[PDB]
Amino acid sequence: MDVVSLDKPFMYFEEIDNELDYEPESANEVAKKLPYQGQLKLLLGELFFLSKLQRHGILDGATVVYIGSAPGTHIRYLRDHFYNLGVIIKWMLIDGRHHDPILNGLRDVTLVTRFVDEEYLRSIKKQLHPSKIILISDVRSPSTADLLSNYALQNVMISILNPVASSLKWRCPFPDQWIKDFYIPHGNKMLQPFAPSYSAEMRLLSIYTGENMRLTRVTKSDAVNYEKKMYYLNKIVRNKVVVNFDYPNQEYDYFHMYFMLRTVYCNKTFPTTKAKVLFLQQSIFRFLNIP
Amino acid sequence: MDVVSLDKPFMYFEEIDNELDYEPESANEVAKKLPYQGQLKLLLGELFFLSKLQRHGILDGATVVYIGSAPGTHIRYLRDHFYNLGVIIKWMLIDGRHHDPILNGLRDVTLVTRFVDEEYLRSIKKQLHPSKIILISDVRSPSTADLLSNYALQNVMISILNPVASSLKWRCPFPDQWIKDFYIPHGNKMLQPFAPSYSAEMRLLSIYTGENMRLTRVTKSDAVNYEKKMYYLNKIVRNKVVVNFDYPNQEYDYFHMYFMLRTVYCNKTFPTTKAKVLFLQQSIFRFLNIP
Ligand SMILES: Nc1ncnc2c1ncn2[C@@H]1O[C@H](CSCC[C@H](N)C(=O)O)[C@@H](O)[C@H]1O
Ligand SMILES: Nc1ncnc2c1ncn2[C@@H]1O[C@H](CSCC[C@H](N)C(=O)O)[C@@H](O)[C@H]1O
Numbered sequence: 001m002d003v004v005s006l007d008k009p010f011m012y013f014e015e016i017d018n019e020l021d022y023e024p025e026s027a028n029e030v031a032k033k034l035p036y037q038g039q040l041k042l043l044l045g046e047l048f049f050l051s052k053l054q055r056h057g058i059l060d061g062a063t064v065v066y067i068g069s070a071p072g073t074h075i076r077y078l079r080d081h082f083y084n085l086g087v088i089i090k091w092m093l094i095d096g097r098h099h100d101p102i103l104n105g106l107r108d109v110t111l112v113t114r115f116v117d118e119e120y121l122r123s124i125k126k127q128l129h130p131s132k133i134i135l136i137s138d139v140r141s142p143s144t145a146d147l148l149s150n151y152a153l154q155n156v157m158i159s160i161l162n163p164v165a166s167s168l169k170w171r172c173p174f175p176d177q178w179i180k181d182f183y184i185p186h187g188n189k190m191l192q193p194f195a196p197s198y199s200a201e202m203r204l205l206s207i208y209t210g211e212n213m214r215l216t217r218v219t220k221s222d223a224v225n226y227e228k229k230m231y232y233l234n235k236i237v238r239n240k241v242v243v244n245f246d247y248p249n250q251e252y253d254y255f256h257m258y259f260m261l262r263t264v265y266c267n268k269t270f271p272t273t274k275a276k277v278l279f280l281q282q283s284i285f286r287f288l289n290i291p
Numbered sequence: 292m293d294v295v296s297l298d299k300p301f302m303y304f305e306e307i308d309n310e311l312d313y314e315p316e317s318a319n320e321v322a323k324k325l326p327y328q329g330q331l332k333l334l335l336g337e338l339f340f341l342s343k344l345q346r347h348g349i350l351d352g353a354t355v356v357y358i359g360s361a362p363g364t365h366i367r368y369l370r371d372h373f374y375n376l377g378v379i380i381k382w383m384l385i386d387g388r389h390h391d392p393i394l395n396g397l398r399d400v401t402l403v404t405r406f407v408d409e410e411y412l413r414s415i416k417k418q419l420h421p422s423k424i425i426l427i428s429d430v431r432s433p434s435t436a437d438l439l440s441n442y443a444l445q446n447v448m449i450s451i452l453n454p455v456a457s458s459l460k461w462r463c464p465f466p467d468q469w470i471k472d473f474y475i476p477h478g479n480k481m482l483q484p485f486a487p488s489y490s491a492e493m494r495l496l497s498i499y500t501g502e503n504m505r506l507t508r509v510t511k512s513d514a515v516n517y518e519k520k521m522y523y524l525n526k527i528v529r530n531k532v533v534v535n536f537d538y539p540n541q542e543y544d545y546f547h548m549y550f551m552l553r554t555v556y557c558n559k560t561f562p563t564t565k566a567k568v569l570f571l572q573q574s575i576f577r578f579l580n581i582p
Contacts, residue, residue, distance in 0.1 A: 213506045
C-alpha cells in the first residue's frame with residue numbers, strides 16, 4: 001500500500017513543492033473511480049468558493065451568474081445549502097444545453113437556454129442591474145485554440161458583468177501545443193479533489209476590489225511548469241493513503257476534501273470538525289447517489 | 292490681468308481640486324497660441340516620461356517603439372538629448388504616414404511606414420526579441436467609437452509587446468456620447484502643458500513590474516468627472532499668470548513646463564534649477580523654431 005503522513009493537503013497550485021516529467025501514457029489511465037465524480041468535483045469547489053464569499057460578507061444579496069451550468073445536478077445541492085442557511089441569493093444558470101429538471105420550480109433560480117456571446121452578456125448586465133454579481137464559469141468548447149477562445153470569453157464575462165467575485169475554469173494549454181502567450185485574471189488557483197486522475201484543471205478564484213482588474217500573463221514556460229507540477233500531484237500525491245488521517249477513507253482526495261469541507265457553515269452544531277465533515281460528506285454523497 | 296501665486300502646478304489628473312460645467316462654446320475658442328505647439332506638447336511629455344525611466348534605470352538598453360510617430364519632428368530632439376547623455380537606446384518609429392527627413396540617417400533609429408495591426412505587432416515582437424521594449428503611443432483614428440477602437444489597439448500593443456513601460460494617449464470620451472464602459476491600463480495621468488486650449492487629453496504613464504497587468508474600468512460617471520475637472524483646468528487655471536513665478540514668462544503653461552523640465556538631466560552643470568530650465572526651454576524652442 002502507498003502510505004504517508006501529511007499535515008495538510010495542497011490547497012493551491014503555488015503550494016505544490018515538486019514536479020515530474022509528464023508521461024503521455026497517463027492519458028490512457030483510468031480517469032475516474034467514482035460514479036458522478038464530475039458533479040462531486042464541481043460541488044466541492046463551488047461550496048469552497050461560495051463559503052469564502054459568505055465569510056467575507058459578499059454572498060448575501062448577490063445574483064450568482066453560472067455560465068456553462070448544464071446539467072447542473074450538483075447546483076441543486078449548492079442552492080439548498082445556502083437557502084437553508086438563510087442566505088438570500090438569486091441564481092441564473094445559462095447554458096445552451098438543458099438543465100436537470102430538479103432545478104425547475106424554484107423562484108430563486110432562473111434557467112436560461114442560450115449560448116452566451118458578448119452582446120448577450122451586455123443585455124443580462126443591463127437586466128440584472130443593479131444587483132451585485134458573482135460569476136461562476138465552466139464553459140466548454142479541445143485544442144489550444146479552443147482553450148484560448150474560452151479564456152477570452154471568460155475575461156469578457158468579467159469586463160461586461162463586472163462581478164464582485166468569480167470562479168473560472170482554468171487549465172493551462174500544453175507547452176508543446178503553444179500558440180501565444182495570454183492573460184488570465186489574477187486569483188487563487190484552487191486545486192480540485194476528485195478531478196479526473198490526470199487532469200491539470202484548477203479553478204481560478206477572484207474577489208474584485210475597487211474598479212481595478214488585475215490580469216497576469218501566461219507564457220509557454222509557465223505552461224511547462226503547470227504540466228510538471230500537476231503531473232507530480234496526480235501521479236504521486238493523489239495516489240497516497242494518508243495513514244495519520246483518522247477518517248473512514250484515508251485516500252488523499254478525501255483528506256483534501258476534508259480541508260475544503262471544514263470551511264463550510266452548517267446550522268447543526270457539531271462536537272468536532274470531523275463530525276461536521278463526515279456529516280457534509282455523507283450528505284453530499286447521498287444527494288449525488290455516490291455509494 | 293489674471294494674476295495668482297501658486298506653489299506648484301497640477302502635474303497629474305488626480306491633483307485637480309475643482310471642477311466646472313463644460314461650456315460647448317469653448318470648442319470655438321482659439322485652440323493654439325504658439326507655432327508648432329503640438330510638437331512642443333509631445334516633446335515635453337515624452338522628455339518627462341523618459342527622464343523618469345532613466346531615473347529608475349530602465350531606459351538604457353531599451354528599444355523605444357513609438358507607434359503613431361509621424362511626422363515626428365520633435366522626436367529628433369528627444370533622440371539627440373539621450374544620445375548626447377550617453378544613454379544607449381534604439382528607436383523604432385512606426386506610422387502609415389511619412390516621417391520628417393531629419394530622422395533619416397541615424398543608425399539608432401528605424402523608420403517604418405506601416406499601419407499596425409495585432410498581427411504586425413506579433414512579428415515585430417518576435418523580431419525585437421530579446422530587447423526590453425518601452426512603448427509610446429500617439430495613434431489617431433473622432434467618434435467615441437473611434438476612441439474605443441484606439442484604446443483597444445493600445446491595450447493590445449501592451450499585451451503583445453509586453454513593454455517594461457508605456458506612455459499612452461488618453462482622452463476620455465464625452466459622457467453624452469457614451470457607448471460602453473471599458474478598461475485602460477493603470478498609470479499616472481500626466482497633464483500636458485501646451486495642450487490645445489480646451490483639450491481634455493493627458494498621457495497615461497505606466498511601468499510594468501512582474502508579469503502582471505493591472506487595468507482600470509472607465510464608466511460614464513468617470514467621463515463626467517474628467518470633463519468637469521479638465522474644463523476647470525483649461526478655463527480657469529491655464530489662463531492664470533503666476534506672479535510669484537520669477538521667470539521670463541509667467542503664464543501657467545510655462546510654470547507647468549518648468550516643473551517637467553526641472554526633472555530632465557543635462558551634461559552641463561548649472562548654478563540653479565532656473566538656469567537649467569531656461570536653458571532647456573531656450574534649447575527646445577530654438578529646435579522647434581518657436582520664437
Ligand atoms: N457560450 C456558452 N454559453 C453557455 N454555456 C456554454 C457556452 N459554451 C459552452 N457552454 C456550456 O459549457 C458546459 C460545459 S460542461 C458544464 C457542467 C456544469 N458546470 C455542471 O454544473 O454540471 C456545457 O453544458 C456547454 O453547453
Ligand atoms: N495603426 C497605426 N499604425 C501606425 N500609426 C498609426 C496607426 N493609426 C494611426 N496612426 C498614426 O497616428 C498618428 C497620430 S498624429 C501623431 C504625431 C506624432 N506622435 C509626432 O511625433 O509628430 C498619425 O501620423 C497616424 O498615421
